[PDB]
């Protein structure tokens, strides 16, 4: 069972967990309460299982999309920031963590995928997806490749799927229609078909995952990658001369990455709710707190106004916001877990040649819908 008198925190391991731990040490120094930061694998799936039994972390960090489901299942404590605190963050970030009229998590940062490119290999990155095959031919002749990114998680291919018409659930007047899924319209099909053609024509490998893409980019094996702000720190360390820019267009339309608000929720089963509120409100969501995390691994555009105002001048953040503006904020509805699983299956099956793009997305639509 969750222990009283300490805080256990779960956060994805590609985020600045060491920096978050620094905020934890500061918390312990002031309160005597020990803070343990952990990054279990597949934490976003482990949470619902263990929290159901009254176990797991006091605080869970994830993009807001998963939180509606946690809330519907009664896994989250309703949070109680007063009016002064709420005023400290951008109103739209609060909207992302609202579910059935209740705030169920604290917004931290706004994430969106960007095109990352090696300036020495590619001083002028492609403006369109359509340009990528020829770049790859040219680079292959130098023992390099044009583009590598994670093909195991649908999050990374979604921008291309959505670019020319793909969407998750139809949204009208502040309500998602869970029976109206947009993963199998002409736009979605066109997008995935292009991705699969890249693979068939040997410009990408269906096996490529996050670690393989990161290694390749950071070692100058590939000219481009697609990734979030968290990834910039490792590139800095690699001494690759990189730029961050708008994603390529597809059929003349911008790529539309799903926008995630990194959020922190409080386990409904936690006997440490007040401590968790104190930690999140008085320590983490301050200029000093977000600074420590961000210095470890960049957060992106933070929810805290005072600190975003000082990050805003960073061109990498301007590119992130530009890509966010072109994309869409993720739904937070409970149906999202089913949506993602359906799209992951379709992309893997189509990329590997197990099913046609059309069969893959037709099953995803059915699987995702109610």
Ligand X SMILES: OC[C@H]1O[C@H](O[C@H]2[C@H](O)[C@@H](O)[C@@H](O)O[C@@H]2CO)[C@H](O)[C@@H](O)[C@@H]1O
Q: Which residues bind ligand X (CB under 6 A)?
A: 12, 14, 44, 63, 65-66, 111, 153-155, 260, 340
73 φ/ψ angles, rounded to the nearest 5 degrees: -80, 0
Q: x/- string (CB under 5 A) for Ni ion, residues 31-70?
A: --------x-------------------------------
Minimum separation from the CB atom of position 14 to Ni ion (A): 9
Q: How far is CA 344 from CA 76, 137, 347, 361, in A?
A: 26, 28, 5, 10
Pick between residue 170 and residue 219 the one whose CB is nearest to a second copy.
Answer: 219
Residue 113 or 266: the one with the smaller Cβ distance to ligand X is 113
Closest listed residue to residue 96, CA positions, set 84, 87, 88, 108: 108
Closest-CA residue to 245 (of 260, 234, 232): 232
Nearer to Ni ion by C-beta: 39 or 295?
39
Q: Give me the least distance between CB of 100 and a second copy, in Å please.
A: 30
212 binds a second copy (CB under 8 A): yes
* Residue 81: count of CB within 10 angstroms of its CB: 17
| CA max distance for the chain | 61
Of 217 and 250, CB closest to Ni ion: 217
Contact (Cβ atoms closer than 8 angstroms) between residue 188 and residue 158: no
CB nearer to a second copy: give 161 or 213.
213
Q: Residue 7 pairs with which residues in a beta bridge?
A: 35
Number of residues that bind Ni ion (CB under 5 A): 2
The per-residue DSSP string of 183-213 comes to TTSHHHHHHHHHHHHHHHTTSS-TT--HHHH
Minimum CB separation from ligand X for residue 141, in Å? 26
Residues forming contacts to Ni ion in the complex (CB under 5 A) are 13, 39
Residues forming contacts to a second copy in the complex (CB under 8 A) are 13, 38-42, 143, 148, 152, 205, 207-212, 215-216, 219, 221, 354
């Amino acid at each position: 069972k969750i222990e009283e008198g300490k805080l256990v925190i779960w956060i994805n391991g590609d985020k600045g967990y060491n920096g978050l731990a620094e905020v934890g040490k500061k918390f312990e120094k002031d309160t005597g309460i020990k803070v343990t930061v952990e990054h279990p694998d597949k934490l976003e799936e482990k949470f619902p299982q263990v929290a159901a039994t009254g176990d797991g972390p006091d605080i869970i960090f994830w993009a807001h999309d998963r939180f509606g489901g946690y809330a519907q299942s009664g896994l989250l404590a309703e949070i109680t920031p007063d009016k002064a605190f709420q005023d400290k963050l951008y109103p739209f970030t609060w909207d992302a963590v609202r579910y059935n009229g209740k705030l169920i998590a604290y917004p931290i940062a706004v994430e969106a995928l960007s095109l990352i490119y090696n300036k020495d290999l590619l001083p002028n990155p492609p403006k369109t997806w359509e340009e990528i095959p020829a770049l790859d031919k040219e680079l292959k002749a130098k023992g390099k490749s044009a583009l590598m990114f994670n093909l195991q998680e649908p999050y990374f291919t979604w921008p291309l799927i959505a670019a020319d018409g793909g969407y998750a659930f139809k949204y009208e007047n502040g309500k998602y229609d869970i029976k109206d899924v947009g993963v199998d319209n002409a736009g979605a099909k066109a997008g995935l078909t292009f991705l699969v053609d890249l693979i068939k024509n040997k410009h990408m490998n269906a096996d490529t995952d996050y670690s393989i893409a990161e290694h390749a980019f950071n070692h100058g094996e590939t000219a481009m990658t697609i990734n979030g702000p968290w990834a910039w720190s490792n590139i800095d360390t690699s001494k690759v001369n990189y730029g961050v820019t708008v994603l390529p267009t597809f059929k003349g339309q911008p790529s539309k990455p799903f926008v995630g608000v990194l959020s922190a929720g409080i386990n409904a089963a936690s006997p440490n709710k007040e401590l968790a509120k104190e930690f999140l409100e008085n320590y983490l969501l301050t200029d000093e707190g977000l600074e420590a995390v961000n210095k470890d691994k960049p957060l992106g555009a933070v929810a805290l106004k005072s600190y975003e105002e000082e990050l805003a001048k960073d061109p990498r953040i301007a590119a992130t916001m530009e890509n966010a503006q072109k994309g869409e904020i993720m739904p937070n509805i409970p149906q999202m877990s089913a949506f993602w699983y359906a799209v992951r299956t379709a992309v893997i099956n189509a990329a590997s040649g197990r099913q046609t793009v059309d069969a893959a997305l037709a099953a995803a639509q059915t699987n995702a819908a109610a």
